[PDB]
Design an enzyme around this catalytic site. Structure first.
Site, short mmCIF file in Angstrom:
data_model
loop_
_atom_site.label_atom_id
_atom_site.label_comp_id
_atom_site.label_asym_id
_atom_site.label_seq_id
_atom_site.Cartn_x
_atom_site.Cartn_y
_atom_site.Cartn_z
N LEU A 1 -9.01 3.54 2.01
CA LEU A 1 -9.95 4.17 1.08
C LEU A 1 -10.92 5.13 1.83
CD1 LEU A 1 -11.52 4.42 -1.81
CD2 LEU A 1 -13.01 2.70 -0.82
N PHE B 1 -8.34 -6.77 2.55
CA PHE B 1 -8.07 -5.40 2.96
C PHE B 1 -8.21 -4.50 1.72
CE2 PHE B 1 -5.26 -1.93 3.24
CZ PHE B 1 -5.09 -1.60 4.59
N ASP C 1 -6.37 6.55 -5.73
CA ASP C 1 -5.79 5.23 -6.08
C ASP C 1 -5.84 5.07 -7.64
OD1 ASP C 1 -8.35 4.42 -6.69
OD2 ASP C 1 -8.57 3.15 -4.87
N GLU D 1 0.82 -1.21 0.00
CA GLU D 1 0.00 0.00 0.00
C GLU D 1 0.83 1.23 0.00
OE1 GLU D 1 -2.97 0.18 -0.50
OE2 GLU D 1 -3.69 -1.84 -0.15
#
Ligand SMILES: [Cl-]
Ligand SMILES: [Cl-]
Ligand SMILES: [Cl-]
Ligand SMILES: [K+]
EC number: 3.2.1.17
Length: 162
Positions: free
Chosen positions: A32, A104, A20, A11
């Site tokens: 997010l 995730f 993103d 990430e």
């Protein structure tokens, strides 16, 4: 290596709100915020996540807090779930970390289209499962991270992360 270090590598860490690969506002370690195109909306979302008037920037400690919360929610989404729980239970530690990575990033909901590949995994058809997994919007959008993840699920080793 562990799930935290894995996801941190996949990430990245960004203290300011960003978008993103699909255009969605995110911050910290893959958190997010919203699927809305409005930055303003994302800003609100951030202040509520943090519990303060942020103006789109957070501290590292704040980022790590959302990440603990996020990993915990992922593990929980697995555990809560009727088809995933059982699938998780049957995997070794490494493959368990990979599945957590997936959830995730994609959520209980994204995970649903992975049912077949997961099942393949359960049947020990690693290679097949892997090819299958690459055939997804998931992989297509962010192939490097997806390739690592798949490799991990495939092999049951951390090679992809060294
Ligand atoms: Cl949150
Ligand atoms: Cl924390
Ligand atoms: Cl908390
Ligand atoms: K990030």
């Amino acid at each position: 290596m562990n799930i935290f270090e894995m996801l941190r590598i996949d990430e990245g860490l960004r203290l300011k709100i960003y978008k993103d690969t699909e255009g969605y506002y995110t911050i910290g370690i893959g958190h997010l915020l919203t699927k809305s195109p409005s930055l303003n909306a994302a800003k609100s979302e951030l202040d509520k996540a943090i519990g303060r008037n942020t103006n789109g920037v957070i501290t590292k400690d704040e980022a790590e807090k959302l990440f603990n919360q996020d990993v915990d929610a992922a593990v929980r989404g697995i555990l809560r779930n009727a088809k995933m729980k059982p699938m998780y239970d049957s995997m070794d530690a490494v493959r368990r970390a990979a599945m957590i990575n997936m959830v995730f990033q994609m959520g209980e909901t994204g995970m649903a289209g992975f049912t077949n590949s997961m099942r393949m995994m359960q049947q020990k058809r690693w290679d097949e499962a892997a090819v299958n997994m690459a055939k997804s919007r998931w992989y297509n959008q962010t192939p490097n991270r997806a390739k690592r993840v798949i490799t991990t699920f495939r092999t049951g080793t951390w090679d992809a992360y060294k």
